[PDB]
Homo-oligomer: A and B are copies of this chain.
Amino acid sequence: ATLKAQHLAKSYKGRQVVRDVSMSIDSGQIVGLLGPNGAGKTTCFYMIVGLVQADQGVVRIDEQNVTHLPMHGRARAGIGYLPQEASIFRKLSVSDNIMAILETRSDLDRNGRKEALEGLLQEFHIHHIRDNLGMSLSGGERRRVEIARALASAPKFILLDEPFAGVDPISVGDIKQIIHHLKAKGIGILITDHNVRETLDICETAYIVNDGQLIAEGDAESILANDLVKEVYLGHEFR
Contacts and interface: CB of A to CB of B under 8 A. Distances in A.
Contacts of A138: 38
Contacts of A38: 138-139
Contacts of A83: none
Interface size class of A (residues with CB under 8 A): 20 to 34
A170 B139 contact: no
Contact of A169 (B37, B167, B234): B234
A14 interface: no
B235 A170 contact: yes
Nearest to A237: B173
Contacts of A237: 169, 173
B235 A169 contact: yes
A168 interface: yes
B37 A173 contact: no
Given A173-B235, A173-B237, 6 more contacts: A168-B235, A169-B235, A170-B232, A170-B234, A170-B238, A172-B235
A85 to B, nearest CB: 14
A36 interface: yes
A232 B37 CA distance: 32
Interface in A156-188: 165-173
A152 interface: no
